[PDB]
Design a protein around this ligand. Structure first.
Ligand SMILES: [Mg+2]
Lengths: 49, 50, 147, 98, 74, 98, 50, 50
DNA sequence: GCTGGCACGACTTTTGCACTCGATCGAATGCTGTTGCACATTCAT
RNA sequence: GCCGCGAUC
DNA sequence: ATGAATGTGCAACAGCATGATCGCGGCAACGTGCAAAAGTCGTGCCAGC
């Protein structure tokens, strides 16, 4: 929520301004960039359900 | 920087771990290609040109 | 996005590494597989009627000699398309039991390690559902522009 | 892995056919070598040579399952330790129960 | 305020579940729908929950039964 | 609120003092060697420009005041504040875990 | 010629911003001995003997 | 045809990242088009190419 | 009667288009692990 | 998006 | 006595060598002619003051 969550940052800023102090986390953009980078090679990486 | 000339070295005597000290010579010029002489563990003259 | 290469090229992930995947899959050394990749030498396939072997490393001069003598029945290519052709023709399941029988029948500390490595790779490939022809890629993906 | 061998030995010995259990020989490896051989590829690819680990993970078609601490830190979920250990205990039962 | 949480820790001794219990109690007291059960001395909700735990008046079991009673009332 | 925070009126200072009251903040040094190299303190505002560190924790931090700098990370969640109070407070870890 | 001369004078391993705190820094920077540079050795390359 | 949310729903449940080789058909599945020109942007309009 | 924004018949610009020919370098870090190849040895006939 | 150079602990 | 298989030893190639800060500079790769369309310019138009 401090570094790479594009929606997490805004959500947690709104929560603090409201005064909620709720986590509501997500998925960092850095790992998505890494997944796109590896997929750009011949290796396929996906997230199983 | 290293002065151009002729430099002899012993390579500390620990390359093949056999205790055989190996003497090598270098010809460092101000400009151009290098030239080295190298002593094998089997006492063979090897020249490492450039 | 993607780009089509209009000709199959080889991936350096599986070619140039100390435990080369294509190296030990084809039972040929890294030097040979690198030489054929750059069109320096040819490799023939099939050729049961002719005296050429399945994985021959005949050079250019041997290529014209075979063409003059054997003529037809000699299927040799110089590019990575040859690697695709020989990789598709390989029957992984049939080779698995053949190498298993060779390993259990004859015992020797030298060939046992390489045989075990090849058997492990073959079993992993047949179990994982992958295919060996996918190592060398014909369509190359590209990174998104924002990255 | 000895942990994988132990459960197989216990399961085989639990049934009637106890002789199926296979004796093993424990091995010792250095830290640089033992770390790279872990059953999860997301870890051991963020410590040493990644070109080697990815291909040996690519051809095998393996899975990570995010069991250790390094994998969960990379993804950004709660690590299975300390305060986050309880949260990973609740999730395990739900997955097993369906 | 509580300079040390040892008194609260020994009430429910894990040093790890205490954090979760205090977080739940502070969430209840902060997002609304709850009032402190211990006199409030201008301090924040975190130390109020910790002092409730230390006094032995807030625990996981009784938190669950209070939630169940609230659900039953509604 | 933005404009008056930039203008830094006195009531903004009073509200900052109200917010700070019991929000633990955790300081750390650059080469975080062991787990005691990042500890959570309770901030007291000073009319100054440098962090004032307690002399006792210098041995744990391996910090001496000859130009040393430390980072100040703010735990901004209820779970994070409890973790920084019940696990990271300086009064909590007195015995070195070695 | 001008391109090479200006490239050497402006962007080189051994032509740096001069220190200007006190005359002492300028004095000790002008008469400075550097083992690095184009013909020199890399920082990682230097052993304990050098 | 309004009130559609895609940024929040982008966070999906997952577990056990899986890695495998990429098929050419699978690669084409990822791709949404083609690239045939080696230019990046045309300075005539300061816009991306075709 | 005086004045100021709309369309039409040539000029003028753009774009598909896919089609070709066209030296001078730094060389200098150990430390370890791995793989391949050459040679010495030993066993069989 | 770096590369060199200098500096602090 | 000699050939072949095996094990051992040696040489070449690959990865890797702390963390966090602050301050100054310097810094890459066309063409082609015509249809076909589109845009533009000089020109004439009605509607408001
Ligand atoms: Mg100091």
């Amino acid at each position: 929520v401090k570094s790479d969550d594009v929606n997490g940052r805004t959500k947690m800023y709104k929560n603090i301004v409201d005064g909620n102090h709720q986590m509501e986390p997500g998925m960092p953009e850095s790992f998505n960039v890494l997944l796109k980078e590896i997929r750009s090679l011949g290796i396929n990486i996906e997230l199983e359900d | 920087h290293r002065s151009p000339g002729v430099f002899f070295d012993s390579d500390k005597g620990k390359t093949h771990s056999s205790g055989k000290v190996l003497y090598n010579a270098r010809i460092i010029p101000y400009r151009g290609s290098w030239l080295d002489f190298e002593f094998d563990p089997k006492d063979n003259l090897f020249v490492r040109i450039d | 996005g993607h780009i089509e290469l209009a000709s199959p090229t080889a991936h350096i992930w599986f070619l140039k590494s100390l435990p080369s995947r294509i190296g030990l899959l084809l039972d040929m050394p890294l030097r040979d597989i690198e030489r054929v990749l750059y069109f320096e030498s040819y490799v023939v396939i099939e050729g049961g009627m002719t005296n050429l072997e399945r994985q021959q490393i005949l050079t250019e001069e041997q290529y014209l000699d075979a063409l003059e003598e054997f003529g037809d029945e000699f299927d040799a290519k110089m590019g990575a398309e040859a690697i695709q052709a020989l990789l598709k023709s390989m029957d992984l399941e049939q080779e698995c039991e053949q190498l298993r029988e060779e390993l259990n029948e004859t015992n020797s500390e030298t060939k046992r390690k390489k045989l075990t490595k090849r058997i492990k790779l073959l079993e992993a490939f047949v179990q994982s559902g992958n295919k060996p022809e996918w190592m060398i890629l014909t369509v190359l993906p590209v990174l998104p522009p924002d990255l | 892995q000895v942990e994988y061998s132990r459960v197989k030995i216990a399961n085989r010995e639990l049934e009637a056919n106890g002789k199926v259990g296979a004796t093993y020989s424990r091995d010792l490896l250095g830290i640089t070598k033992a770390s790279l051989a872990t059953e999860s590829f997301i870890s051991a690819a963020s410590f040493q040579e990644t070109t080697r680990v990815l291909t040996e993970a690519a051809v095998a078609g393996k899975r990570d399952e995010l069991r250790g601490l390094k994998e969960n830190v990379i993804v950004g979920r709660l690590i299975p330790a300390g305060t986050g250990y309880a949260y990973h205990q609740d999730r395990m039962r739900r997955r097993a129960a369906g | 305020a509580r300079v040390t949480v040892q008194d609260a820790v020994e009430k429910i001794g894990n040093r790890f579940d205490l954090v979760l219990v205090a977080a739940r109690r502070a969430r209840q007291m902060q997002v609304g729908g709850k009032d402190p059960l211990v006199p409030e001395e201008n301090d924040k909700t975190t130390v109020i929950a910790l002092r409730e735990i230390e006094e032995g008046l807030i625990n996981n079991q009784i938190l669950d039964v209070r939630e169940r009673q609230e659900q039953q009332e509604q | 609120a933005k404009k008056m925070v930039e203008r830094e009126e006195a009531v903004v200072w009073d509200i900052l003092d109200e917010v700070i009251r019991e929000h633990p903040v955790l300081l750390n040094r650059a080469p975080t060697l062991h787990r005691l190299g990042i500890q959570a303190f309770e901030p007291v505002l000073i009319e100054g420009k440098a962090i004032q560190l307690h002399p006792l924790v210098c041995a744990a931090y391996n910090a001496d005041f000859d130009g040393d700098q430390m980072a100040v990370h703010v735990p901004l969640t209820l779970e994070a504040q409890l973790e920084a109070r019940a696990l990271m407070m300086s009064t909590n870890n007195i015995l070195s875990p070695a | 010629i001008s391109a090479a001369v200006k490239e050497f004078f402006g962007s080189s391993q051994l032509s740096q911003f001069m220190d200007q705190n006190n005359p002492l820094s300028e004095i000790t920077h002008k008469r400075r001995i550097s083992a690095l540079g184009p013909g020199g050795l890399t920082r990682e390359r230097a052993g304990f003997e050098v | 045809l309004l009130k559609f949310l895609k940024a929040q729903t982008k966070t999906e449940e997952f577990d056990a990242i899986k890695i495998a080789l990429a098929s050419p058909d699978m690669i084409r599945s990822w791709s949404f088009g083609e690239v045939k020109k080696p230019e990046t942007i045309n300075y005539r309009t300061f816009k991306p190419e075709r």
